[PDB]
Amino acid sequence: GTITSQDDNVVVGYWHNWCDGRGYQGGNAPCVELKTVNPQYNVVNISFMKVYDIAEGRIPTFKLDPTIALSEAEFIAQIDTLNSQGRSVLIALGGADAHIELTRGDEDALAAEIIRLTDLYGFDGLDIDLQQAAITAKDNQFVIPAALKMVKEHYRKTGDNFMITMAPEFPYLTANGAYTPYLTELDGYYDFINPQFYNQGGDGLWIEGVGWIAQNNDALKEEFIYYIADSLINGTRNYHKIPHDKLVFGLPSNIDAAATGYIQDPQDLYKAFDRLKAQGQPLRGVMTWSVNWDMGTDAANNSYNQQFIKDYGNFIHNQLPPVTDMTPTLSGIVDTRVELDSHFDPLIGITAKDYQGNDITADVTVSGSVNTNQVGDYLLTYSVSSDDETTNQPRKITVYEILPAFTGITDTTVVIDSEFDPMQGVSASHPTQGDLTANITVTGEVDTNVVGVYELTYQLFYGQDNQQNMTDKRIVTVVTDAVSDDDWQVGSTYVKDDKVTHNGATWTAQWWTKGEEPGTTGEWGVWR
Ligand SMILES: CC(=O)N[C@@H]1[C@@H](O)[C@H](O[C@@H]2O[C@H](CO)[C@@H](O[C@@H]3O[C@H](CO)[C@@H](O[C@@H]4O[C@H](CO)[C@@H](O)[C@H](O)[C@H]4NC(C)=O)[C@H](O)[C@H]3NC(C)=O)[C@H](O)[C@H]2NC(C)=O)[C@@H](CO)O[C@H]1O
Ligand code: NA
Incomplete structure (x- = not known):
């Protein structure tokens, strides 16, 4: 089939390229045929593209696990079947324990391989699921975005929207965090982000006025979902902004699928999503690790029997289509210290993009002024407008x-x-x-x-x-x-006619003495 993308809400499910994965509570995730995945998973992510052996070089690839008993051609056929149903099948790059380490210049070969795999299998896009060192290794933060822009443009030529998604663990989404190069370089290119809100234990966020809300707190799960999403979709509370129309909430299917993060009571999610809708910012869907876990067994060999899709499929699909947040972005603005009388140029290093990623730097305006001939603080405000929206950001300049x-x-x-x-x-x-x-x-x-x-x-x-x-x-x-005569010493023994210097004068001993200070023995004593 053809490149099939999703315009409306998504329920994303990852698909294991392996059999009988062990659960965090001793359960089992069988391999499953694609054609058996519940239709309500409208995005299915083949897991994973990675480096299989360093002797094939640095560029990652995808190799179907034959023990799933799908031939290459049958796997292709089942992707085609999904595409015929209007469902998307992405290739997920990385995964746990996948090391990928690319060097500047590798982008062309990486793009070529993504295209090759995409054309052969009928994938509809790629999910960036880099974890651990792979997020920052060598030149990955440059190479992977560079390659993906090339892929996006390649398919745009033929009128196709090759989907780009990402699955950052949430802690990496702070404003200057490790994923932020992928997010900023691919602004306008990515379809949605489905961060992982699982496997982070007691991590979470501080809400001024309610306290710490942790990802493993099952008493405050509604607040967890609401406040972390609210912070992401507005760029507040030290999180990088991911627009609401592009935010998909990633979750474990059940307690076997992840150590922590499972939602015990789906009502907590329904209510949080409703609250986000009430403030004008409905989310774009949910994501889960994984369709295999949703169709898996627990340690007692009882079937999960699709509980995740049961809890969330209808809730997420029975929603209005997304409404695009068209606000532009500013980049590069940081409070700066400037030495007295040095030259200061308020435009250097600062850029801007519209919501589609087009450069609109030339449209940035600055208000305020800096006097480098006077020590003190100076406040600038940068603004840019596009698409009937405006973004502003302050910058303090200290001389x-x-x-x-x-x-x-x-x-x-x-x-x-x-x-x-x-x-x-x-x-x-x-x-x-x-x-x-x-x-x-x-x-x-x-x-x-x-x-x-x-x-x-x-x-x-x-x-x-x-x-x-x-x-x-x-x-x-x-x-x-x-x-001069040697200095008097309190512990020395002197005899008649010995001379010493003390307190600025030269004194002569008139008899045997030890321990008597010159100048203190009067008119007729031992020192004269
Ligand atoms: C910021 C930080 O450092 N956080 C630490 C966690 O990263 C770490 O636990 C790891 O958490 C990640 C992120 O969720 C997790 O990887 C995702 O989660 C699933 C499992 O829940 C992974 O599934 C495994 O995939 C591998 C193949 O890559 C299989 O071999 C394995 O069988 C799978 N496990 C299961 C149960 O199916 C996914 O690959 C991955 N991506 C997505 C989209 O979900 C890691 O597995 C976690 N690692 C471990 C060792 O638990 C945590 C504990 O170390 O510590 C945090 O600080
Ligand atoms: Na396709």
Whole structure:
């Protein structure tokens, strides 16, 4: 069949390219034929395209597991059957424990392989399900989006919408998180995102005013679904924005399918989705790992018997078609610190796209202004409008100054009659003004002919018109070279006529002494 895409809500189910997968609670997921998957799964994701063996190179591929007992041709035929029913069959890239590591330049070969597989099997698109290191390995965050843009454009030439979806684990969807390169580079290209709201334990989000709402909290599941979706579809609470018409809520089919995240009471989902509809932002569907688990068994060999599709198929399909959120995006805006008097260009690094991913950078306007000749904060607001919508974002620009620094102003002792130059070895620097040594003045003098302690005050003048100042003090001690009688020591023994220096004077012992301080023994004592 032909490239078959979905214009309305979706119930997405992954399909295991393997048999008898073990459950987190000891159950079993059989392989199943595609033709047996419930019709209400209108998107079925073949899992997974990956690197099967590094000896075939870096480019991932898909290899049907023959033990499912579908020949290549029969598998093809069953995809065609789904397509004839108006259902989409995507290829899912990655999965758990799949390492993919591509280098800049690999994009052409990756696109070529996606096209080859797509044309051979009749796939309708690709789901990005990179996990763990594969999300950020080498140049993946560049190569995979680059390849996918090529694939999208290739099929657009013939009037076909090759679907692009993604299945990020939700924690990666913070505003600057690991998936954000895939989301931004593919804005306009992707059909919807179905994040995984499972296998993350106690992770979740903080709602100012209700507290922490965790993905494994079964008492607050309605609030979990509502608030995490609300944050995604509006770009609030530190999440990257995924428009509501493009957000599909990914879930485990049952307790065997994922460690945590199963919805015990489907009412919690119905109500959360209704609340999102009530604020004008209905979601685009649900997704599940997996149709195999939905048709699987538990540890007691009891059948799950399609409970997931029973709970959610009709609820999600019995909804109005999606209404596109046509708001444009701005990229590259970050609060920036600028050194006093440096040049600042408010447009550099900032771009914009309409909701279809067309570049509309030239249409960005900025209000506010920065005065780099004055330290302080300056607030800019960037705006762009397209498609009867507007997006705005602020940017704080802080102008700061750095103090210069002196070198070589350290206390020093010099010998009598030596030459002393107060500027020898003395300098000052500043990162933008450069060498400021010629801007140093010296208050005070050293007289090296006269023993004693001389204070010098160094002043540095700098900045505009040399009206900024900083000061540092230096002590220069001039000492004689003259040989003196050895210093008195409290523990030494002296006898008549021994001489000692103490407290600035030379004293002579008049008899035997130990422990008596010169100067403290009066008019007629041992030291004179
Ligand atoms: C942010 C972070 O680091 N989170 C950690 C979790 O990542 C981690 O648990 C892993 O969670 C992922 C994300 O859900 C999960 O992978 C998805 O989930 C299903 C299982 O629920 C995977 O199914 C397995 O696929 C492999 C083939 O790739 C099969 O070999 C295996 O039999 C499948 N298991 C079952 C029960 O069917 C999917 O591949 C995958 N994608 C989708 C769309 O669902 C991993 O399996 C989880 N890994 C483990 C070891 O549990 C968690 C625990 O380590 O820690 C979080 O911090
Ligand atoms: Na097809």
